[PDB]
Amino acid sequence: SDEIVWQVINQSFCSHRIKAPNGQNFCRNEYNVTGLCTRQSCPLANSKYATVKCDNGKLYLYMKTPERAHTPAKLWERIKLSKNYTKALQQIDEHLLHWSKFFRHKCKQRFTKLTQVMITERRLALREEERHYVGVAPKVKRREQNRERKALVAAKIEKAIEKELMDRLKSGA
Amino acid sequence: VLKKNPLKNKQVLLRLNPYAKVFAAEKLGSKKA
């Protein structure tokens, strides 16, 4: 039963539970809509669930029902949302007919967040960066410091400058 | 959530003692013998 599973996952070491310093428990399950391990939010403890996911740029409406609880292979019935904010929201509302207000509202919120996350193309389209984050290991740092000091010591910059000056102004102007 | 002290802020004062409006309009406080 869901209640037994809900109790077994609240306590008794649910696999995906993150103990944040604030005390909030964060769920890392991909199918979760809020990412938090709470009631009516964890897909495992809820026979009926709805979430929005996307492999490619297309956004899908993943939903779960008790019918496929016996068949974990094809539990979710994803449907394409025909990417467009207004019509996608209308389609989500139509699909989630008579569903809980919580599920509908949070699915719409997840879809909106994912759609606005697609703006990442803006950063990729207008980046023209000349820095490209570079990491330097401490071992490389040591070889770039002690060797530099040795080169400076062996260079004899003052002596070289004096020799060059004594040569330039000894055979011409 | 917050206590509205009467004797000031006539708005709350009128909520209690509905005779306050009559008292003020009639100037009963300065009644003459």
Binding site: L97, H98 | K3, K4, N5, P6, L7, V12, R15, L16, N17, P18, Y19, V22, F23, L28, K31, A33
Partner: protein, 241 residues
Amino acid sequence: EKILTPESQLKKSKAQQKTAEQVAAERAARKAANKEKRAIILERNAAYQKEYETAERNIIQAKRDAKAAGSYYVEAQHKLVFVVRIKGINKIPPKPRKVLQLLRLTRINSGTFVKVTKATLELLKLIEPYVAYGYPSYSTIRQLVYKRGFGKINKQRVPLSDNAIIEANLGKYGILSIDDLIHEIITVGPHFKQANNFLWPFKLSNPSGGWGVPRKFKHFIQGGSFGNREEFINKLVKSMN
């Protein structure tokens, strides 16, 4: 084919509609009752104001007639006194402390209305050094009930801010408004005890202008603070309040 609403959802909707109809009917009845009670409270307040004016005019006229006739006037005995704690909650002997606790004077600058009786007079005399009391006037009682008027509801100090609050608890004895409570307190009646018990003990601050004496711990008849100050108690309370 068309998707039909869940049967449980249909039952929930039917129950919600049926409950909402009753809620609207109750709201209309409550509005009508509130209007009627507001009218009743208005007429009661007018009657109480007229009664107070007539009483004061009669007292003054009786005093003047007694003066003119050459016969001494028999002033009515006082029946209501307000007692305010002066000393602290430490170093108090057990006997006065028990009386103060019985009077709900558990902290400094705290007071309550006490009925005047032969028995209560002895209690006040017992705790005379640690308390100051007098004869409150109508204005002081009204100001106290209006500003620091807190009622005791199911062991909770619910502030008094609406006639409905008083009516719910004190409506059994006919007290359905703050004005009714003030009238009962000032004019001791059959249900004075219940009204006094319902009111939470008053929490008063230090006087705005100060106690006015270099040493509080002395009899009021000798420049002190405690004792029995007949009329100066009103001024003391007003400064404290």
